Design a protein around this ligand. Structure first.
Ligand code: ATP
Ligand code: ATP
Lengths: 213, 208, 213
């Protein structure tokens, strides 16, 4: 049933086109030709921008767009825990299922989508951190190993949103983990019109808006 | 279960003092039964149960110190309803130091061993908050003081993923999968590690 | 059994009227027109001003005014704790009831009120504590994520009082989190007169005031 109009997105035409281009072109072609080229698939996205533009909305609409297993969402720093090493247990529990599925089916398995929220709370520069809590460093390193370690996993997509992109570590923003880094900005008059029509559709439908507007 | 009047006796042996059991005659009660000892209307203590006189309950010095029991006091002895799938600890927090200050050293002790040994030695025993006991490793002696008790979530007992809603309980039962943590009393030298011996991240301010 | 004169507040008629218009208008209007309208309630109010003007009185009287459950009150920095991850758990422990009821009764659910006193003690602009900031930033991110995350709550109302509005992080003040911003200032002469009668009503009633005053 999907069509662009049902997602309710505003004036983010160019960004959406670029995302679909740079992230989803491979999966749409027949397996034969894509195998002929022999290219690898993206597994990460990093949206950023000023507060209150709709980043989470885009992520959830992206989730709706894909037919796949229900995304696993890590709502901020829910991973930290007071016992030593317990957070790493949680992290690995995330990837266990995907690993097992890919082992059982091989190259022709389904896709798994993972959404990380408030990524800056977890991942900050390992070196630039309060000496007292190496738990952060272990988490970052463990994560880096898991997402891109010697072993390759290719049925995962990771989404990360923040508000102050400077704080993010350099080691994570490299090709293979998050290369595509988008900037969302203010819309123009047409996008504002689209939003207003979206938020006025019911008022026109139920005839509760005067014609003088 | 009706309370019996009993006389407080002295624990017959130090070996029995190491079991943390209240020692009774076989005519009165069976090994592994649990009792509530009432010393006054407001004080109820729960304990796990041939040389003990029938009609007497022999208490060790630590148990008597913790519970405030004198030898020869008449006491009412009954039983706790020890809930089944709840209490049994999920993890516990204990304070540790060398039992006597003359044995101190500062090198690290591999201590996951000491927790596994703790679970092996005191399996299926009752434990409560505030209780004091003694432990031994590397032929060195340690004093211990329980400070917190989280149960297992009853779901784990049901064979299901834990929610994280661990209840905190006035008494807990050690079972073959319980865990324990050993935080030092500040003044100390006893370096420790293990890995699972547990030390919550200290979250302490420091001024430059 | 509610009467405006019963709460013994004088000199703030205009502010209270505006507050009532912006906050409780949706929940008192008959529903059917509202479902036709398709709007969502507002879940944030902040009050600020110089010391000793009567903010806490407004909060307490508002709490007594509404017909709902006993409000949950947090007295300053009660959330901080010595073990990592427990602050976050406590925070979640604030919203757990709301989540349960939302899941169970859906639309037909009661209202929940939470009051934060001295919010400036726990919420400060991220990246401003030189030491031990590991706990502060987690706290701030947790609060932001809880108020508005992927999961949506529709039975929560938040009222806050503060003394230093310009030191707070911008992320907590965007629309959708704390919309109704109110300033309580010094009263004028008429307010002073009203207040004096308010606080002298009992004495006048019992004839304990001389006739030459
Ligand atoms: N461009 C937009 N298109 C549609 N709705 C929008 C847009 N910008 C804001 N909104 C509305 O306001 C909300 C603000 O965006 P959202 O909740 O995704 O926050 P965010 O900007 O991702 O997060 P943060 O405020 O933490 O930086 C949207 O969920 C939506 O209800
Ligand atoms: N506008 C007012 N009308 C009536 N009484 C008032 C008013 N302002 C203050 N009072 C009286 O002053 C008392 C103290 O006010 P209150 O503690 O609410 O101030 P506050 O602004 O909450 O405090 P602060 O900002 O200094 O922490 C009130 O309980 C009330 O008796």
């Amino acid at each position: 049933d999907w069509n662009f109009e049902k997602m309710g997105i505003g004036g983010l035409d160019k960004e959406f086109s670029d995302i679909f281009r740079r992230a989803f072109a491979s999966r749409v072609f027949p397996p034969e030709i894509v195998e002929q080229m022999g290219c690898k698939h993206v597994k990460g996205i990093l949206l950023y921008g000023p507060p209150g533009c709709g980043k989470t909305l885009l992520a959830r609409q992206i989730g709706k767009m894909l037919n796949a297993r229900e995304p696993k969402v890590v709502n901020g720093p829910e991973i930290l825990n007071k016992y030593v090493g317990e957070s790493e247990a949680n992290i690995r529990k995330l990837f266990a299922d995907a690993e097992e599925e890919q082992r059982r089916l091989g190259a022709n398995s389904g896709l798994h989508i993972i959404i990380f929220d408030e990524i800056d709370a977890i991942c900050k520069q390992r070196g630039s951190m309060a000496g007292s809590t190496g738990v952060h460093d272990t988490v970052v390193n463990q994560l880096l190993s898991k997402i891109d370690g010697v072993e390759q996993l290719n049925n995962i997509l990771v989404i990360g949103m923040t508000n102050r992109p400077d704080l993010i570590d350099e080691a994570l923003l490299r090709p293979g983990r998050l290369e595509v880094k988008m900037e969302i900005g203010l819309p123009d008059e047409k996008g504002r019109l689209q939003i207003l029509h979206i938020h006025t559709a019911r008022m026109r439908g139920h005839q509760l808006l005067s014609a003088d507007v | 279960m009706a309370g019996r009047s009993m006389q407080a006796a002295r624990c017959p042996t130090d070996e029995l003092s190491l079991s943390n059991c209240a020692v009774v005659s076989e005519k009165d009660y069976q090994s592994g039964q649990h009792v509530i000892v009432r010393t006054s209307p407001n004080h109820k203590y729960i304990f796990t149960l041939p040389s003990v006189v029938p009609g007497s309950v022999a208490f060790s010095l630590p148990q008597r110190k913790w519970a405030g029991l004198s030898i020869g006091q008449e006491i009412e002895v009954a039983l706790y309803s020890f809930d089944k799938a709840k209490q049994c600890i999920g993890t516990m927090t204990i304070e540790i130091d060398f039992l006597q200050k003359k044995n101190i050293d500062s090198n690290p002790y591999d201590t996951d061993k000491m927790a596994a040994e703790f679970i092996q030695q005191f399996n299926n025993q009752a434990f409560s908050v505030g209780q004091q006991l003694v432990f031994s490793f590397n032929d060195k002696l340690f004093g211990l003081l329980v400070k917190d008790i989280e149960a297992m979530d009853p779901s784990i007992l049901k064979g299901e993923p834990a929610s994280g809603k661990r209840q905190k309980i006035e008494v807990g039962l050690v079972v073959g999968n319980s865990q324990v943590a050993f935080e030092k009393a500040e003044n100390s030298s006893l370096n420790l590690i293990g890995k699972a011996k547990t030390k919550e991240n200290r979250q302490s301010i420091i001024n430059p």
